[PDB]
Design a protein around this ligand. Sequence first.
Ligand SMILES: Cc1cc2nc3c(=O)[nH]c(=O)nc-3n(C[C@H](O)[C@H](O)[C@H](O)COP(=O)(O)OP(=O)(O)OC[C@H]3O[C@@H](n4cnc5c(N)ncnc54)[C@H](O)[C@@H]3O)c2cc1C
Length: 391
Amino acid sequence: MKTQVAIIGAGPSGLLLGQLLHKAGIDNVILERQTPDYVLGRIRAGVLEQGMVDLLREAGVDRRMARDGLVHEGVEIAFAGQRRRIDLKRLSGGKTVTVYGQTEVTRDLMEAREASGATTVYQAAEVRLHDLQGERPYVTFERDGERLRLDCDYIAGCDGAHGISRQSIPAERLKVFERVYPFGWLGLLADTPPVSHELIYANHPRGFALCSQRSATRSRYYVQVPLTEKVEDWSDERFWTELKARLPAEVAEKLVTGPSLEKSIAPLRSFVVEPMQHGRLFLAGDAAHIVPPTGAKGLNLAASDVSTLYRLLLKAYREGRGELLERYSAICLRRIWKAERFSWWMTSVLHRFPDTDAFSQRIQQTELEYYLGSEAGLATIAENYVGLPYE
Ligand SMILES: Cc1cc2nc3c(=O)[nH]c(=O)nc-3n(C[C@H](O)[C@H](O)[C@H](O)COP(=O)(O)OP(=O)(O)OC[C@H]3O[C@@H](n4cnc5c(N)ncnc54)[C@H](O)[C@@H]3O)c2cc1C
């Protein structure tokens, strides 16, 4: 079989790229290791930047989002017995963020693709990439037990943190930047109404806590935990008790608790590779970079990588300007590093780090006091949170 663009991975990045390309008339095939069900079981993201929202509209998949998504104009940070609201809309010059689950976004994309008739191969096992620096690269995979070959012009590596694509680039060509944090987030999804109409990020001596939501009757909570913790050691009641201990009394008092629909621990880390391409292979999303969840940027950065790749692929196919593809990495990395810096900052000021001295603890507290009390300081948080413009 042959196609124009082979896409490895049917997560948000691959699906969104596939939809945009299909609409523009560029044939593409998506190869996914897992089943549609497994992919749909991943909870993950809840916060979307306006840029991503606009990209979903451009891809023609925003009906349900426009209907069910919750537009947020502010967010709160709680620390040292204070609750500060950052008016995102006012301080960012009118921008806002939208709360709509990643599960929902993926479901919408999957249905759109399904309907268009575009090719998607689930349970594509043993994916291998070949002749990346040739004029004719190809992908091999096994379906049932037979090895099939897919010829194409370009390959988009949208296979996430553990994908094969990044591993297919000669190690000596890539420079890696990584930072592993000494804690993870224990998340809990409950069919309960959220404690607040806006998100609450809390810095507490016991550790970080976050109050988020999916809708008016579905909530998502997180608490910072050591990497040595096992989700089996955390019953629902232990979670609720701990959550309450980290929130302001007035907030903890209004909390409606309930059995969890999903519980899991996500370790925190930063990871960037340079460049993000090799020959005819281009990396996008988590395959190229990981950001801690604190700044709500992961999926959002996948969106800008995809928007950039789609636009450059259009110029190459439609305008015959293939040389522009060499600019992919430079363009993406400018936005990536800025979102990485923001996510790193948010993580450092909101969490409790082990073995930090008195001086560091006071500086952490003063960072919050300063940034949440100065108009210029609040503006730096707001413009970064709603999302820096796409280039
Ligand atoms: C707890 C948590 C909270 C988060 N909150 C937010 C948020 O609020 N906002 C935000 O912007 N981001 C958030 N993120 C990040 C966001 O979820 C990710 O950045 C997003 O999932 C990345 O999408 P992707 O498509 O690049 O990769 P993934 O979702 O990982 O999809 C990659 C796909 O490729 C497939 N694949 C892998 N290997 C192969 C292979 N060898 N062959 C073929 N297929 C393969 C995988 O099965 C998978 O389906 C959060 C993440 C976590 C963990």
